[PDB]
């Protein structure tokens, strides 16, 4: 002691909360498009008929 107390430092405890990516395992493909919109075209063809 005296004027002040002599300290030793130890290693700094760190915690770093991330968020693991669970739902992105079903989205594998990627589109990098410079147009405005993206259009799909879905078709259902019934064949089962006597």
């Amino acid at each position: 002691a005296g004027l002040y107390t002599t300290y030793q430092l130890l290693e700094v405890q760190r915690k770093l909360k991330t968020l693991p990516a669970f739902f992105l395992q079903w989205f594998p493909r990627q589109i990098n498009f410079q147009e405005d919109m993206i259009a799909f075209d879905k078709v259902i063809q019934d064949v089962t008929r006597v």
Partner: protein, 152 residues
């Protein structure tokens, strides 16, 4: 009082003498304590070692010995859901004894049960239980404790 700065929400008080308490209520209570450790702690380490006391283990066995080791309990070889190995019959030594293991199936949610009844002699020369007997403590090896030694 050298207070090390532990949070006051961790020091709990529940009741295992009220009616209606089952086995899964007590395991759920220990699991609530495990959640409050796994949020506050730095490493986020799941506590796998539960050191009980003598009266706490007696209360645990008295409440849950009909549910556990029963018609389709945890320690039932017909069920595929667990691989618990808690001994029915244990010797009594003043000391520490490894009572068993409360694992799920594939190494999941496992708890190691210790019972500690060592008795140190007091400052005032009296017998006192080292591990507190009416309590449950769960500690992990991620506490990373440090033996401090000052100047002689």
């Amino acid at each position: 009082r050298v207070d090390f700065g532990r949070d006051a929400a961790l020091t709990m008080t529940t009741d295992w003498t009220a009616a209606g308490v089952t086995l899964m209520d007590m395991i759920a209570d220990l699991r609530d304590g495990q959640r409050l450790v796994s949020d506050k702690s730095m490493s986020g380490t799941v506590i796998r070692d539960y050191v009980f006391g003598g009266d706490a283990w007696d209360q645990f066995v008295k409440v849950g010995g009909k549910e556990l080791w029963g018609k389709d309990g945890l320690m039932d070889s017909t069920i595929r859901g667990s691989e618990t190995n808690v001994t029915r019959l244990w010797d009594d030594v003043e000391g520490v004894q490894y009572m068993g293991e409360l694992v799920g199936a594939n190494g999941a949610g496992r708890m190691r049960i210790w019972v500690n009844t060592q008795k140190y002699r007091d400052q005032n020369d009296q017998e006192q239980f080292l591990m507190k007997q009416k309590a449950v403590m769960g500690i992990s090896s991620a506490i990373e404790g440090v033996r401090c030694f000052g100047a002689i």
